[PDB]
Amino acid sequence: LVFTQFWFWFPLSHFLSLAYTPTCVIGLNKDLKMPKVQYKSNCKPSTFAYPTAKAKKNPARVMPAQLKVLTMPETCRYQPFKPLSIGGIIILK
Amino acid sequence: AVDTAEQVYISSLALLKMLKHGRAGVPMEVMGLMLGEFVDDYTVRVIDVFAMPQSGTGVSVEAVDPVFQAKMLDMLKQTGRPEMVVGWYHSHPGFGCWLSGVDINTQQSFEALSERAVAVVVDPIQSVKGKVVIDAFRLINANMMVLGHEPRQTTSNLGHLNKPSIQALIHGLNRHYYSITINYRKNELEQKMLLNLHKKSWMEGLTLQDYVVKEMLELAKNYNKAVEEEDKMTPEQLAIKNVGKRHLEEHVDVLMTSNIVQCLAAMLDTVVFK
Amino acid sequence: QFRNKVLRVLVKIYMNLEKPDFINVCQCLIFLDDPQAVSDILEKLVKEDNLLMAYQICFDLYESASQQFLSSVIQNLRTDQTLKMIKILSGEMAIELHLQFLIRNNNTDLMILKNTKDAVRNSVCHTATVIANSFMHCGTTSDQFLRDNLEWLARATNWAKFTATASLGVIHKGHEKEALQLMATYLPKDTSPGSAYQEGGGLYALGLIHANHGGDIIDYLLNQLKNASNDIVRHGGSLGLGLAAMGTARQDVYDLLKTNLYQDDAVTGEAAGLALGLVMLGSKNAQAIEDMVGYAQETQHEKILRGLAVGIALVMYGRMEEADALIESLCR
Numbered sequence A: 001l002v003f004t005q006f007w008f009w010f011p012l013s014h015f016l017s018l019a020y021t022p023t024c025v026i027g028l029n030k031d032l033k034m035p036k037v038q039y040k041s042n043c044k045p046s047t048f049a050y051p052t053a054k055a056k057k058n059p060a061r062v063m064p065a066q067l068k069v070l071t072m073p074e075t076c077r078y079q080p081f082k083p084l085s086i087g088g089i090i091i092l093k
Numbered sequence B: 001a002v003d004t005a006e007q008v009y010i011s012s013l014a015l016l017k018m019l020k021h022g023r024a025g026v027p028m029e030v031m032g033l034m035l036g037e038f039v040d041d042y043t044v045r046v047i048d049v050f051a052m053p054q055s056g057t058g059v060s061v062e063a064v065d066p067v068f069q070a071k072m073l074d075m076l077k078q079t080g081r082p083e084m085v086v087g088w089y090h091s092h093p094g095f096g097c098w099l100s101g102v103d104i105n106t107q108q109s110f111e112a113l114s115e116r117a118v119a120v121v122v123d124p125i126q127s128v129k130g131k132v133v134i135d136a137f138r139l140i141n142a143n144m145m146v147l148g149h150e151p152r153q154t155t156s157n158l159g160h161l162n163k164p165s166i167q168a169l170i171h172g173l174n175r176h177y178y179s180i181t182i183n184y185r186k187n188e189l190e191q192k193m194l195l196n197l198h199k200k201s202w203m204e205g206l207t208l209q210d211y212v213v214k215e216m217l218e219l220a221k222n223y224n225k226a227v228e229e230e231d232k233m234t235p236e237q238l239a240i241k242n243v244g245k246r247h248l249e250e251h252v253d254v255l256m257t258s259n260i261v262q263c264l265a266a267m268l269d270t271v272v273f274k
Numbered sequence C: 001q002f003r004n005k006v007l008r009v010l011v012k013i014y015m016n017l018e019k020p021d022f023i024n025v026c027q028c029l030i031f032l033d034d035p036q037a038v039s040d041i042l043e044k045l046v047k048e049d050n051l052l053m054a055y056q057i058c059f060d061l062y063e064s065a066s067q068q069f070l071s072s073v074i075q076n077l078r079t080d081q082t083l084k085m086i087k088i089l090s091g092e093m094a095i096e097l098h099l100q101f102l103i104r105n106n107n108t109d110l111m112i113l114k115n116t117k118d119a120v121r122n123s124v125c126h127t128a129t130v131i132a133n134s135f136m137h138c139g140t141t142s143d144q145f146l147r148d149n150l151e152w153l154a155r156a157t158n159w160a161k162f163t164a165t166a167s168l169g170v171i172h173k174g175h176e177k178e179a180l181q182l183m184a185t186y187l188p189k190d191t192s193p194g195s196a197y198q199e200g201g202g203l204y205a206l207g208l209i210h211a212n213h214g215g216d217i218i219d220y221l222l223n224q225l226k227n228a229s230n231d232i233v234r235h236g237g238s239l240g241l242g243l244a245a246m247g248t249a250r251q252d253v254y255d256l257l258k259t260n261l262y263q264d265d266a267v268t269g270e271a272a273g274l275a276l277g278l279v280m281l282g283s284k285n286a287q288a289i290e291d292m293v294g295y296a297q298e299t300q301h302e303k304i305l306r307g308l309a310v311g312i313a314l315v316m317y318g319r320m321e322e323a324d325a326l327i328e329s330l331c332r
Helices: A011-018 A064-069 B012-024 B066-078 B101-113 B155-162 B168-172 B189-202 B217-231 B233-240 B253-264 B266-272 C002-016 C022-030 C035-048 C051-063 C067-078 C081-088 C093-104 C110-118 C125-136 C160-171 C179-185 C196-209 C216-226 C234-244 C251-261 C269-279 C286-298 C302-315 C324-331
Strands: A026-028 A089-091 B007-010 B031-038 B043-050 B088-091 B119-122 B135-137 B181-184
Touching: A011 C125, A011 C160, A011 C196, A011 C234, A026 C093, A089 C051, B007 B012, B012 B043, B012 B088, B012 B119, B088 B101, B101 B119, B155 B181, B217 B233, B217 B253, B253 B266, C002 C022, C022 C035, C022 C051, C035 C051, C035 C067, C035 C081, C051 C067, C051 C081, C051 C093, C067 C081, C081 C093, C110 C125, C125 C160, C160 C196, C179 C196, C196 C216, C196 C234, C216 C234, C216 C251, C234 C251, C234 C269, C251 C269, C251 C286, C269 C286, C269 C302, C286 C302, C286 C324
Parallel strands: A026 A089, B007 B043, B007 B181, B088 B119
Antiparallel strands: B031 B043, B031 B088, B119 B135
């Protein structure tokens, strides 16, 4: 809304900063325990590598369309509590 | 210390006075001063305008008579609320709106007197309601030309200002100048009064004599019937022509409206009276 | 009306199930706005000692809920496990880790900045360039793309530089803790005491940094605005203070905002009105709306009125066809 209003004022443009939520998928097992998970996208990076179906990574520049295709790596000891259908902050156990 | 895309509000009384005064002395190149009012740097308004007396000098600075303006200001203070003289207007009948050396000298003098000293240019070039050749100009000093001309901080208003762009002669003399956005001051009571004026005065809406109407109607319909009968040939040929890789004539909305109104006149004829 | 009843009935059905899946239990909090209910279920989890689900639902709501009732949820929770719960339902450790994630990964091209630079027009698009670079690394705290050349910010009118320093602040978004000293680094007195434009831009940037991030910055900005010039600087300071206290509904800021609005000033009053609208976000507080609408038609400035327009619009919202009276009054 403030951006739309920025046609009558320039300084207001900065307000778009509030409307910025990165698509990174955050994962953490414990209170601060960083996890060594690497979800297999099972798709061509192509979109990932914006300047062999697979992908690895902590959160990365993975998009909702690519998030829905990500594969949860059960091969590791700890697994997410809830599915990884879509990104966000999914904790692990 | 920085210019912007400012605006000048002009009261309907103001523009009416300016145009009538200009048309009054078109050959003489009449001129005068306004009585404007300050609100902020972005916006300034004008409500009243008086005519400085005719002088053979022209638009010269000396044409301003201190005693005349002092007397007018005193009288206005006595009756109603006046305001400090924002600037000057004149009619440049030559072609559109522009300025000359004398004009810039006068503007510089006023700018020495006050802040804006906005200049107004009118011309006899007018339409019934579709010219408003009026325009507003303001000069730029040659000291800050290193600095930006008019620091802009709004896209919408700057683009609207550019939409008028600049006139041929304007570019011919656009320098030392920068036009300032004008707009008609909000108008409701005056607007409503005028709207009431049109119905009864500026066009036939007396509403009591509002309703030949049976004398010449026969003849008008005769003409149009004959004309449509003639025009019917062209669609005939058009249809006659094959695929081959002036039928549009309308002429029927006019008849529709005219004779339907005439028939409706029966409502007045048989009921409204007697 | 049907929505609330169906939602409560179905959530009752769900928690009647063996496992009260917190994912479907969040409906009460986020759609039916039952902060007390979420607090109670969190207390049940706490006494049940399954912190995993506890902070899972906490993060879910925090990233998918409005602070207005998260405040009440936190109050209920407050009155170890409790300390951790408060922290996660507290000043945005999620934001901290998000920003850590952001700095840890960046893909930005200098060549774009260079292509903009060599295409410089010596005109207003200076502001567009600075805001574009702001968008480039929003929250990245990487100004070297600008620190390299100190002329893009040294070739602007005193007014655009306000936007430039605001952009500088925007690039640095989320640190909060060090934001005080970080902004002081480019402090207006340090940078240009004579440029009150940068003076206001400093407060604007400070407010931008703590976007929706409550904290002592709100009171600090309140004090700064209290002791400062009414017009020359107060625009950006008031705007940033309002943004940092968005929806907080606090009276201690509402009073200052209304005073600013009533200081019959144009240059800063529009920002004051925008902030006034921002703080009373979707509160439907009839007192505020009547005050603002009455003041709108009462003054004789456009800028003031233009700001107050969006301020009013943002005052009451998210009510669908509830404020129709105000809608009709403004429409006519």
